[PDB]
Amino acid sequence: ESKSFAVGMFKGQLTTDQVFPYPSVLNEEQTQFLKELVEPVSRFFEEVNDPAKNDALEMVEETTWQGLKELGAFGLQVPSELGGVGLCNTQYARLVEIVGMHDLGVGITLGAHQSIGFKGILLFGTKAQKEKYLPKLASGETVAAFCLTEPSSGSDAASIRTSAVPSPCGKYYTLNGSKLWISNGGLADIFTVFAKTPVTDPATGAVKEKITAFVVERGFGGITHGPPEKKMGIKASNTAEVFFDGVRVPSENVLGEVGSGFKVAMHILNNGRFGMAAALAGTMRGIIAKAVDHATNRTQFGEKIHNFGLIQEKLARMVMLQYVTESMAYMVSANMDQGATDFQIEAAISKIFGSEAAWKVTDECIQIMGGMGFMKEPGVERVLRDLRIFRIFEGTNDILRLFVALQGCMDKGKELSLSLSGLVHPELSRSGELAVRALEQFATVVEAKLIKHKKGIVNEQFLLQRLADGAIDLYAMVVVLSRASRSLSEGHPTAQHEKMLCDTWCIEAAARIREGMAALQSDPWQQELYRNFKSISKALVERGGVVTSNPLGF
Amino acid sequence: ESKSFAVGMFKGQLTTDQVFPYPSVLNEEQTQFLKELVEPVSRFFEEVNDPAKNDALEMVEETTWQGLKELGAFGLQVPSELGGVGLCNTQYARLVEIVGMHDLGVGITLGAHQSIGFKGILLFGTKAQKEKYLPKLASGETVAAFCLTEPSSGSDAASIRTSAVPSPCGKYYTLNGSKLWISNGGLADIFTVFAKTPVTDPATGAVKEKITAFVVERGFGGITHGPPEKKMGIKASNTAEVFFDGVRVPSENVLGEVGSGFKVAMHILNNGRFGMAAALAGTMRGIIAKAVDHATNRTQFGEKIHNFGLIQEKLARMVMLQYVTESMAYMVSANMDQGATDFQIEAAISKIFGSEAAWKVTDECIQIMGGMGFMKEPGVERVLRDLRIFRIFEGTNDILRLFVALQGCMDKGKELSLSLSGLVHPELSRSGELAVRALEQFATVVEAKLIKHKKGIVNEQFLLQRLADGAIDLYAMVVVLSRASRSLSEGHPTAQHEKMLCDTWCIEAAARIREGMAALQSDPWQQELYRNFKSISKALVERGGVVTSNPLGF
Numbered sequence A, B: 001e002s003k004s005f006a007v008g009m010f011k012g013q014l015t016t017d018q019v020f021p022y023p024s025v026l027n028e029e030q031t032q033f034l035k036e037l038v039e040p041v042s043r044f045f046e047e048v049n050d051p052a053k054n055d056a057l058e059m060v061e062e063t064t065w066q067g068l069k070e071l072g073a074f075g076l077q078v079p080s081e082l083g084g085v086g087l088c089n090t091q092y093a094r095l096v097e098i099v100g101m102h103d104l105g106v107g108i109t110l111g112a113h114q115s116i117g118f119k120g121i122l123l124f125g126t127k128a129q130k131e132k133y134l135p136k137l138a139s140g141e142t143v144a145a146f147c148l149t150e151p152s153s154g155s156d157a158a159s160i161r162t163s164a165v166p167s168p169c170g171k172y173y174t175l176n177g178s179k180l181w182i183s184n185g186g187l188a189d190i191f192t193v194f195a196k197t198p199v200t201d202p203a204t205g206a207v208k209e210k211i212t213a214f215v216v217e218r219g220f221g222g223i224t225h226g227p228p229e230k231k232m233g234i235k236a237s238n239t240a241e242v243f244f245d246g247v248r249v250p251s252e253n254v255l256g257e258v259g260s261g262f263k264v265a266m267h268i269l270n271n272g273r274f275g276m277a278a279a280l281a282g283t284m285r286g287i288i289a290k291a292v293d294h295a296t297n298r299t300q301f302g303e304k305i306h307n308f309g310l311i312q313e314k315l316a317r318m319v320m321l322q323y324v325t326e327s328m329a330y331m332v333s334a335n336m337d338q339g340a341t342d343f344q345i346e347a348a349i350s351k352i353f354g355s356e357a358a359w360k361v362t363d364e365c366i367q368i369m370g371g372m373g374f375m376k377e378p379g380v381e382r383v384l385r386d387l388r389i390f391r392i393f394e395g396t397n398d399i400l401r402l403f404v405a406l407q408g409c410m411d412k413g414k415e416l417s418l419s420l421s422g423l424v425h426p427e428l429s430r431s432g433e434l435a436v437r438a439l440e441q442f443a444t445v446v447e448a449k450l451i452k453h454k455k456g457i458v459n460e461q462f463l464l465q466r467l468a469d470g471a472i473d474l475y476a477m478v479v480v481l482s483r484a485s486r487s488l489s490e491g492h493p494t495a496q497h498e499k500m501l502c503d504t505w506c507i508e509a510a511a512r513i514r515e516g517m518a519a520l521q522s523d524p525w526q527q528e529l530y531r532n533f534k535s536i537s538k539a540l541v542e543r544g545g546v547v548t549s550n551p552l553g554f
């Protein structure tokens, strides 16, 4: 039976192993080691890095780049014996939030390198491959890049065209194709490359085309890259086409099993996913400090503006968004450190929630600052620009919603083929009940929809996006119920404040789930909306844009 | 009795004079004249202007700038006899949407010049002032700027510190202060300047400080400007501090009445307000064409992506947003052309709705385009960057929400001190009823809240923002009910499509109003939310940012 909360809640179960109590994973020594890293990393971003400069230059300033290499920043999760810092996921998250607070351009360059670029070697590498490649990865002597996307293939990884053909001797593969929008593409000397190869069935010998993952060195020859792409934000991060022209890849540079490269890609991306919400929790923390500072000190209509309800509500919503996001990020990383095998839905939720929360929080920080928020000098507009892509890469949020909904449905569909008392703190019992009723409402709809649509539920995308949103708010609720309950249990100095953040969040989340589930189940107009969305869009496509003229008709 | 729909609906009245039937204002000759302008203006933006270039240069390319002057673009609403094109509001809106479609940087430069920069001369100018200034304004020989904002004073115009002291002879005023973020500040030779002057009461002679508006020529001396400010978008538009050092302004350059400058400012801004929704309707039209083109031609998972429900719903929502916005813009301009005196709430609604709609539509166009939407070359990210400020300038949307709510309350508060049959087309009767029930729900709450809070309703900002949103959706509903009803009545070729846009919009708008009004009136948790928003924000301000640590506590 799954220990995943998200897997259970689609089945109307309360599976709480990976949720309550809010996990603590670090031993005393890991805690002390992390403290002694947090200080120098924080000082480095404060004193050496200049985010506005990197953005202006469209690259990381060389002193900063070399300084990060010296700091160990290129190898945070590589074991010490292979020349890294040897951090676990939770320690990694703590340092990642520092980067996220200060410079997402730098963040993407370092995360492309290690969260995904050479991650597959950590996850699937043989001893030989790890010993060969990790030390120079960890020191940043060889930068890495994750090479999946192509001109034809973004969301649909299975459709990639880059190919790898085995030699007759079986000693190497010949690699041909191109990859698009590769972070560190123009900088990397090590590439994780996903290519279609012929795969022999063990029983019959029948040959089929499947993806295989490879570790590819720039020095193998036949590799070039395009010029850095110009883009809205994270402008300091290198983004480039990578070309593979008759590249000879040693057979021993297969990463994982021949033909299991799709699974390899998906595991790498799943594994790295929590890092995003971690970074963005930091982004939001920094941004909220700026918005609070503005509201504290700006007089308008005779008072400092923090005294006006519109501003108070904006600030309150921002911190709730930050708290939920940060709470998800550290829960998922703890689950991973504690040996969880089933956290993929929760990781997807955290990615969707965190990227959207950070976008909304930074958008409202601009609004609070007024005219000044739009100016370049305050640096907030630069962070908004950086943020836009986080909703699109590492799985578009639209595709991740489909994933959350369909993955959650899977086990309930297989089958078809409650109290938080004693877990939530007594001071949060009412919100705990809100969550349990929301779970019941959610599961009832899931069951009814699976019975109705069966396997054809996969094409019901209006419904699936709405189910995903229910799932997101349901996980958000129990994540903050857990964290605030532990705070209350421990008598932590912020516990009464966290209790308030939790109750405030839950009241509105429960309402979104109640009203959302009602729309799906009982609302006779819902099907008219769905029909009209399709007919309206069909009409736009026929026309190539807006169908109506303006009222004048020309 | 007010002929304003918005004024009536706060009182639970259906006042439809300025709504149904959807207004037509142009005579045959005005229609033909406008057609012969639309073509050359459209060609100019297509063939001469380069929006990406202006953005890169952070100014309007000189050939474009001179070409616009030649086109008559600096004087669209100046009467022909004073050297302008002589357009009415509706004709102006039609050309403004072309600019909005193509280049909001150019749009802001031209609108700062004419929608507000010299607008006060058109509205309040003596014959002498009009004859003196308008011809060179209209030809663009002298560019104009609206000089209201100061370092201390943005939303609170009444708090401005720039001062004008009359001379003993009464022949001139001496002007001292500075203005901040003035569009065309570094380019203008004519400024509408708002300054505090001593004002003598006609009965008692008692002197009080009130704002007075002035027409100020750069050549009067003592005027300098700062360097162009760097900002997120509309980068082609000049934005600069303007300094006034002992500036001698002829007494005859008072615009309107001494001491009525606040009213002058507010009238200019109200008068220009519809131009924004007009421009942004055009922005959205252009953007939707780009999103449709992308969805039409992108294959992923084996189909063109317009075949997937998530994409269909995005497209449908975008066009509804465009249609509502465009419908409001042309309704307000028609009301103005037809002599309406009370359209200020409707104008504010259109500004809030249009700026937010354009932001959301362009944001979703990026999402549809995926990775490509974030790249500079497609030009969509540039339009998103341009758009952010439209929610902040010409009245922040937060302040405009307070205005809509409090202005709407005023007449009902004074007092306190239904069918659309035969107006809506029979094919839209159900949605017409939706609107009437939504109006009843809305008015009931307004009455109950005014009785409860009385004059103290002004400090109930959580409530007021929620009432403003109800008002916005209520006006949106009747605007599209009207436009689609006229389309149906006339048998216009797009009528069945507009009927669908209208029904789809209304079903969800009615629901937002139902659920929103219920939250305000009957929901026992609403007051707990409001209390918590205040306590959470108070806690952030005390701390200077996020109160919680991360779960590790350091």
Ligand SMILES: Cc1cc2nc3c(=O)[nH]c(=O)nc-3n(C[C@H](O)[C@H](O)[C@H](O)COP(=O)(O)OP(=O)(O)OC[C@H]3O[C@@H](n4cnc5c(N)ncnc54)[C@H](O)[C@@H]3O)c2cc1C
Pocket (backbone or CB within 6 Å): A112, A145, A146, A147, A148, A149, A153, A154, A155, A156, A180, A181, A182, A183, A184, A231, A239, A389, A392, A393, A394, A395, A396, A397, A398, A399, A461, B298, B299, B300, B301, B305, B308, B309, B310, B311, B367, B368, B369, B370, B371, B372, B374
């Ligand atoms: C700056 C940046 C850095 C990047 N770095 C890397 C990198 O390091 N390595 C790498 O491999 N790639 C990288 N990429 C690729 C990035 O992950 C992709 O852009 C992303 O996966 C989306 O793919 P796409 O752009 O091809 O959009 P598409 O997959 O074509 O999607 C287009 C739109 O259709 C929607 N859609 C697609 N399929 C469906 C469906 N079945 N149902 C409903 N909606 C659907 C999508 O959500 C999206 O809204 C990078 C991209 C950016 C721009």
Ligand SMILES: Cc1cc2nc3c(=O)[nH]c(=O)nc-3n(C[C@H](O)[C@H](O)[C@H](O)COP(=O)(O)OP(=O)(O)OC[C@H]3O[C@@H](n4cnc5c(N)ncnc54)[C@H](O)[C@@H]3O)c2cc1C
Pocket (backbone or CB within 6 Å): A298, A299, A300, A301, A305, A308, A309, A310, A311, A367, A368, A369, A370, A371, A372, A374, B112, B145, B146, B147, B148, B149, B153, B154, B155, B156, B180, B181, B182, B183, B184, B231, B239, B389, B392, B393, B394, B395, B396, B397, B398, B399, B461
């Ligand atoms: C590029 C651009 C161009 C501009 N061009 C011109 C121009 O041509 N002429 C000109 O005169 N000005 C111009 N400005 C000024 C612009 O209109 C102001 O920035 C705007 O009016 C907001 O004022 P502020 O920035 O001082 O913010 P503030 O008024 O200080 O507001 C700060 C925040 O507090 C909120 N707030 C304020 N008061 C209240 C309250 N009572 N209750 C609840 N919330 C409140 C606001 O909504 C905002 O979110 C320009 C600004 C920009 C950046």
